[PDB]
Amino acid sequence: ATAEKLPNIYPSTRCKLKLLKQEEEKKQLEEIRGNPLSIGTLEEIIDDDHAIVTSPTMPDYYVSILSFVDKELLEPGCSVLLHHKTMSIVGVLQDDADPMVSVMKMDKSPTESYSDIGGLESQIQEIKESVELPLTHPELYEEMGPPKGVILYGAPGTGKTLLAKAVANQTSATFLRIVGSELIQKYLGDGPRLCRQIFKVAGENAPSIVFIDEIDAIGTKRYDSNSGGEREIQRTMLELLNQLDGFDDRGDVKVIMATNKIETLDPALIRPGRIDRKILFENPDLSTKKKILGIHTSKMNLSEDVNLETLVTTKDDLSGADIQAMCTEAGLLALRERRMQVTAEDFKQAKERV
Amino acid sequence: NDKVRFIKDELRLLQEPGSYVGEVIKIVSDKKVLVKVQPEGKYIVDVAKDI
């Protein structure tokens, strides 16, 4: 019943919304603008209430806004309403788009939740406390403050990758995942711009979760700045460091570091007092493995021949992925068996393969 | 008579300024489509009422 009343309520809202007298006045304000008008890009600004512009055809005319909307709403080098006469700024014009930055996984409150990934919790506190904790922002207030970022280690797809979005999901900020090998280019200086573009986003879309994976390459100080040593290595990293060592947060924009090559990196690349956090994924001990086991093992359908301990003890200290991985091809064997309920044998097989 | 008007019909359109193709950059709420003509640059311009 009330659904009807709810629907028309939604409807009446649409009406008033569309109802934006003022309409004429608004149209009067449109009837001002005339039409059709001309796109054109900003360049600089003065209080002049005249400013000149930028065009692909490149007329650049010194022009006023039609003033109700604002100059300060916009930045130099931005497309603006222009007439076709003088290309008069008609007002605030987006120039919305900018849907690109260098190489990233563009995602927010991502799929991975710490529940999902198999129990890693011992280090989840690390990532939770350093980030998720100030993400609540409540206690961190009294805490007086929160580190910048963390450093993952161990294996991706179990420790490194799975954890990565866990708190990223949990805090529900903008999770930005990248690889340094997803930077460069071998050329000099946009590696920074890559970061910049990223940091543009990072600065822009805050809160966000910065992620970084496998700095094997852009991060190695070597011993030398010369004799074949590619500047861009440091040249990038330093700038990445500049925005890194130029920012830590109280719980807004959070960083993640995922890689196995550790001291390839500068100490201030960590800059303790800022990055306090090393996550390192290990082979989960039989219990902790069992912790992840029961998760992925059970979520895999199977026949009661299967047992965790049947799998648990038989193991070499696998990765928490190999859990998944054994579990993975395990059913694949049952698929090669063309069955929907997996035996215990496939598991041992699938593991002793993988 | 079908012919006549028809043969006559072409006579008008022979008078034309031109017809601009365009490459739409986008639209906005304004109902002025935001466009870069291919040889020209970008203009944000109104649409036909029929669309």
PDB file of N, CA, C and O in Angstrom, chain A residues 30 33-41 56-57 79 81 84 87 93-96, chain B residues 25-30 32-36 39-47:
ATOM      1  N   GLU A  30      19.433  31.383 -19.000  1.00  0.00           N
ATOM      2  CA  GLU A  30      19.874  30.685 -20.200  1.00  0.00           C
ATOM      3  C   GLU A  30      19.689  31.558 -21.425  1.00  0.00           C
ATOM      4  O   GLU A  30      20.585  31.666 -22.270  1.00  0.00           O
ATOM      5  N   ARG A  33      22.463  33.227 -22.320  1.00  0.00           N
ATOM      6  CA  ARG A  33      23.650  32.600 -22.878  1.00  0.00           C
ATOM      7  C   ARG A  33      23.634  32.607 -24.391  1.00  0.00           C
ATOM      8  O   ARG A  33      24.687  32.681 -25.033  1.00  0.00           O
ATOM      9  N   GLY A  34      22.449  32.537 -24.982  1.00  0.00           N
ATOM     10  CA  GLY A  34      22.374  32.279 -26.399  1.00  0.00           C
ATOM     11  C   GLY A  34      22.899  30.888 -26.671  1.00  0.00           C
ATOM     12  O   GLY A  34      23.163  30.131 -25.729  1.00  0.00           O
ATOM     13  N   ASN A  35      23.071  30.559 -27.950  1.00  0.00           N
ATOM     14  CA  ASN A  35      23.357  29.196 -28.397  1.00  0.00           C
ATOM     15  C   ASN A  35      23.314  29.072 -29.922  1.00  0.00           C
ATOM     16  O   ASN A  35      22.688  29.890 -30.589  1.00  0.00           O
ATOM     17  N   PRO A  36      23.986  28.059 -30.483  1.00  0.00           N
ATOM     18  CA  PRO A  36      24.856  27.128 -29.777  1.00  0.00           C
ATOM     19  C   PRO A  36      26.128  27.842 -29.448  1.00  0.00           C
ATOM     20  O   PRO A  36      26.407  28.874 -30.046  1.00  0.00           O
ATOM     21  N   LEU A  37      26.885  27.331 -28.504  1.00  0.00           N
ATOM     22  CA  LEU A  37      28.068  28.037 -28.070  1.00  0.00           C
ATOM     23  C   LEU A  37      29.290  27.197 -28.412  1.00  0.00           C
ATOM     24  O   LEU A  37      29.192  26.168 -29.085  1.00  0.00           O
ATOM     25  N   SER A  38      30.455  27.670 -27.996  1.00  0.00           N
ATOM     26  CA  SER A  38      31.717  27.113 -28.458  1.00  0.00           C
ATOM     27  C   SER A  38      32.525  26.594 -27.280  1.00  0.00           C
ATOM     28  O   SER A  38      32.695  27.287 -26.272  1.00  0.00           O
ATOM     29  N   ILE A  39      33.016  25.366 -27.418  1.00  0.00           N
ATOM     30  CA  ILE A  39      33.984  24.825 -26.480  1.00  0.00           C
ATOM     31  C   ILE A  39      35.272  25.616 -26.588  1.00  0.00           C
ATOM     32  O   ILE A  39      35.614  26.120 -27.661  1.00  0.00           O
ATOM     33  N   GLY A  40      35.978  25.751 -25.475  1.00  0.00           N
ATOM     34  CA  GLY A  40      37.348  26.217 -25.525  1.00  0.00           C
ATOM     35  C   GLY A  40      38.003  26.093 -24.172  1.00  0.00           C
ATOM     36  O   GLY A  40      37.340  26.169 -23.136  1.00  0.00           O
ATOM     37  N   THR A  41      39.329  25.978 -24.202  1.00  0.00           N
ATOM     38  CA  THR A  41      40.141  25.556 -23.068  1.00  0.00           C
ATOM     39  C   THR A  41      40.749  26.748 -22.342  1.00  0.00           C
ATOM     40  O   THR A  41      41.148  27.736 -22.962  1.00  0.00           O
ATOM     41  N   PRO A  56      41.749  24.147 -29.997  1.00  0.00           N
ATOM     42  CA  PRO A  56      42.456  23.339 -30.998  1.00  0.00           C
ATOM     43  C   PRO A  56      42.699  24.106 -32.275  1.00  0.00           C
ATOM     44  O   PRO A  56      43.837  24.156 -32.756  1.00  0.00           O
ATOM     45  N   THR A  57      41.665  24.753 -32.809  1.00  0.00           N
ATOM     46  CA  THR A  57      41.849  25.714 -33.883  1.00  0.00           C
ATOM     47  C   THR A  57      42.702  26.890 -33.438  1.00  0.00           C
ATOM     48  O   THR A  57      43.138  27.684 -34.275  1.00  0.00           O
ATOM     49  N   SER A  79      38.594  23.403 -20.358  1.00  0.00           N
ATOM     50  CA  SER A  79      37.660  23.805 -21.397  1.00  0.00           C
ATOM     51  C   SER A  79      36.501  24.588 -20.803  1.00  0.00           C
ATOM     52  O   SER A  79      35.909  24.176 -19.805  1.00  0.00           O
ATOM     53  N   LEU A  81      32.938  27.293 -21.500  1.00  0.00           N
ATOM     54  CA  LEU A  81      31.892  27.837 -22.338  1.00  0.00           C
ATOM     55  C   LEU A  81      32.440  29.055 -23.045  1.00  0.00           C
ATOM     56  O   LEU A  81      32.995  29.939 -22.399  1.00  0.00           O
ATOM     57  N   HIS A  84      30.548  31.910 -29.955  1.00  0.00           N
ATOM     58  CA  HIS A  84      31.261  31.900 -31.215  1.00  0.00           C
ATOM     59  C   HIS A  84      31.640  33.301 -31.646  1.00  0.00           C
ATOM     60  O   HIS A  84      32.269  33.471 -32.691  1.00  0.00           O
ATOM     61  N   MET A  87      34.307  34.164 -28.511  1.00  0.00           N
ATOM     62  CA  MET A  87      34.557  33.023 -27.651  1.00  0.00           C
ATOM     63  C   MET A  87      34.420  33.460 -26.202  1.00  0.00           C
ATOM     64  O   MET A  87      35.240  33.128 -25.358  1.00  0.00           O
ATOM     65  N   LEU A  93      32.361  25.489 -17.335  1.00  0.00           N
ATOM     66  CA  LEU A  93      32.200  24.384 -18.257  1.00  0.00           C
ATOM     67  C   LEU A  93      33.186  23.315 -17.862  1.00  0.00           C
ATOM     68  O   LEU A  93      34.381  23.583 -17.715  1.00  0.00           O
ATOM     69  N   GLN A  94      32.658  22.134 -17.653  1.00  0.00           N
ATOM     70  CA  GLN A  94      33.430  20.947 -17.657  1.00  0.00           C
ATOM     71  C   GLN A  94      33.362  20.415 -19.054  1.00  0.00           C
ATOM     72  O   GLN A  94      32.253  20.367 -19.592  1.00  0.00           O
ATOM     73  N   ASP A  95      34.456  19.984 -19.694  1.00  0.00           N
ATOM     74  CA  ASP A  95      35.801  19.597 -19.194  1.00  0.00           C
ATOM     75  C   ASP A  95      35.748  18.703 -17.952  1.00  0.00           C
ATOM     76  O   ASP A  95      36.633  18.697 -17.107  1.00  0.00           O
ATOM     77  N   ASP A  96      34.724  17.855 -17.937  1.00  0.00           N
ATOM     78  CA  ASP A  96      34.620  16.774 -16.971  1.00  0.00           C
ATOM     79  C   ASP A  96      35.763  15.780 -17.064  1.00  0.00           C
ATOM     80  O   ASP A  96      36.507  15.628 -16.088  1.00  0.00           O
TER      81      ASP A  96
ATOM     82  N   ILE B  25      31.878  15.116 -28.815  1.00  0.00           N
ATOM     83  CA  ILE B  25      32.734  14.828 -27.683  1.00  0.00           C
ATOM     84  C   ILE B  25      31.900  14.265 -26.546  1.00  0.00           C
ATOM     85  O   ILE B  25      32.335  13.335 -25.863  1.00  0.00           O
ATOM     86  N   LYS B  26      30.690  14.799 -26.349  1.00  0.00           N
ATOM     87  CA  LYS B  26      29.736  14.309 -25.357  1.00  0.00           C
ATOM     88  C   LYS B  26      28.498  15.192 -25.333  1.00  0.00           C
ATOM     89  O   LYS B  26      28.327  16.058 -26.192  1.00  0.00           O
ATOM     90  N   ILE B  27      27.575  14.915 -24.421  1.00  0.00           N
ATOM     91  CA  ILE B  27      26.538  15.887 -24.109  1.00  0.00           C
ATOM     92  C   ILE B  27      26.632  16.270 -22.646  1.00  0.00           C
ATOM     93  O   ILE B  27      27.464  15.744 -21.899  1.00  0.00           O
ATOM     94  N   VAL B  28      25.749  17.170 -22.228  1.00  0.00           N
ATOM     95  CA  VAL B  28      25.561  17.519 -20.828  1.00  0.00           C
ATOM     96  C   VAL B  28      24.056  17.653 -20.638  1.00  0.00           C
ATOM     97  O   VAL B  28      23.285  17.503 -21.593  1.00  0.00           O
ATOM     98  N   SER B  29      23.627  17.922 -19.405  1.00  0.00           N
ATOM     99  CA  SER B  29      22.239  18.259 -19.123  1.00  0.00           C
ATOM    100  C   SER B  29      21.728  19.393 -19.995  1.00  0.00           C
ATOM    101  O   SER B  29      20.525  19.457 -20.268  1.00  0.00           O
ATOM    102  N   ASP B  30      22.622  20.271 -20.452  1.00  0.00           N
ATOM    103  CA  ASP B  30      22.231  21.455 -21.210  1.00  0.00           C
ATOM    104  C   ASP B  30      21.390  21.117 -22.425  1.00  0.00           C
ATOM    105  O   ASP B  30      20.732  21.997 -22.992  1.00  0.00           O
ATOM    106  N   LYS B  32      22.753  20.674 -25.037  1.00  0.00           N
ATOM    107  CA  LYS B  32      23.652  21.105 -26.085  1.00  0.00           C
ATOM    108  C   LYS B  32      24.734  20.044 -26.164  1.00  0.00           C
ATOM    109  O   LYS B  32      25.510  19.873 -25.220  1.00  0.00           O
ATOM    110  N   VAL B  33      24.760  19.310 -27.262  1.00  0.00           N
ATOM    111  CA  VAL B  33      25.741  18.248 -27.413  1.00  0.00           C
ATOM    112  C   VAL B  33      27.123  18.874 -27.528  1.00  0.00           C
ATOM    113  O   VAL B  33      27.296  19.938 -28.136  1.00  0.00           O
ATOM    114  N   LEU B  34      28.101  18.227 -26.913  1.00  0.00           N
ATOM    115  CA  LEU B  34      29.460  18.737 -26.822  1.00  0.00           C
ATOM    116  C   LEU B  34      30.290  17.955 -27.825  1.00  0.00           C
ATOM    117  O   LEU B  34      30.382  16.728 -27.740  1.00  0.00           O
ATOM    118  N   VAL B  35      30.857  18.647 -28.802  1.00  0.00           N
ATOM    119  CA  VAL B  35      31.251  18.015 -30.048  1.00  0.00           C
ATOM    120  C   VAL B  35      32.530  18.646 -30.558  1.00  0.00           C
ATOM    121  O   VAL B  35      32.734  19.851 -30.395  1.00  0.00           O
ATOM    122  N   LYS B  36      33.384  17.834 -31.176  1.00  0.00           N
ATOM    123  CA  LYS B  36      34.405  18.348 -32.074  1.00  0.00           C
ATOM    124  C   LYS B  36      34.130  17.919 -33.499  1.00  0.00           C
ATOM    125  O   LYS B  36      34.215  16.738 -33.835  1.00  0.00           O
ATOM    126  N   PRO B  39      37.180  18.301 -39.129  1.00  0.00           N
ATOM    127  CA  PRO B  39      38.152  19.354 -39.463  1.00  0.00           C
ATOM    128  C   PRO B  39      38.147  20.498 -38.466  1.00  0.00           C
ATOM    129  O   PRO B  39      39.212  21.053 -38.165  1.00  0.00           O
ATOM    130  N   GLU B  40      36.981  20.854 -37.925  1.00  0.00           N
ATOM    131  CA  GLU B  40      36.910  21.916 -36.932  1.00  0.00           C
ATOM    132  C   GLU B  40      37.432  21.407 -35.593  1.00  0.00           C
ATOM    133  O   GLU B  40      38.023  20.330 -35.487  1.00  0.00           O
ATOM    134  N   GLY B  41      37.238  22.223 -34.564  1.00  0.00           N
ATOM    135  CA  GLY B  41      37.552  21.835 -33.209  1.00  0.00           C
ATOM    136  C   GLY B  41      36.292  21.526 -32.439  1.00  0.00           C
ATOM    137  O   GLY B  41      35.265  21.171 -33.024  1.00  0.00           O
ATOM    138  N   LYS B  42      36.351  21.666 -31.128  1.00  0.00           N
ATOM    139  CA  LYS B  42      35.238  21.302 -30.275  1.00  0.00           C
ATOM    140  C   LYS B  42      34.263  22.454 -30.095  1.00  0.00           C
ATOM    141  O   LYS B  42      34.650  23.588 -29.808  1.00  0.00           O
ATOM    142  N   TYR B  43      32.984  22.141 -30.258  1.00  0.00           N
ATOM    143  CA  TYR B  43      31.907  23.066 -29.950  1.00  0.00           C
ATOM    144  C   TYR B  43      30.849  22.317 -29.174  1.00  0.00           C
ATOM    145  O   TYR B  43      30.544  21.163 -29.488  1.00  0.00           O
ATOM    146  N   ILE B  44      30.299  22.959 -28.163  1.00  0.00           N
ATOM    147  CA  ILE B  44      29.166  22.405 -27.451  1.00  0.00           C
ATOM    148  C   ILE B  44      27.930  23.100 -27.983  1.00  0.00           C
ATOM    149  O   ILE B  44      27.779  24.319 -27.868  1.00  0.00           O
ATOM    150  N   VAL B  45      27.055  22.324 -28.606  1.00  0.00           N
ATOM    151  CA  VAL B  45      26.023  22.888 -29.456  1.00  0.00           C
ATOM    152  C   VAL B  45      24.745  22.101 -29.282  1.00  0.00           C
ATOM    153  O   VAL B  45      24.757  20.914 -28.967  1.00  0.00           O
ATOM    154  N   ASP B  46      23.630  22.773 -29.514  1.00  0.00           N
ATOM    155  CA  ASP B  46      22.348  22.144 -29.314  1.00  0.00           C
ATOM    156  C   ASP B  46      22.128  21.054 -30.359  1.00  0.00           C
ATOM    157  O   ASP B  46      22.847  20.942 -31.354  1.00  0.00           O
ATOM    158  N   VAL B  47      21.147  20.207 -30.082  1.00  0.00           N
ATOM    159  CA  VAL B  47      20.844  19.059 -30.919  1.00  0.00           C
ATOM    160  C   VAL B  47      19.673  19.379 -31.830  1.00  0.00           C
ATOM    161  O   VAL B  47      19.145  20.496 -31.816  1.00  0.00           O
TER     162      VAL B  47
END
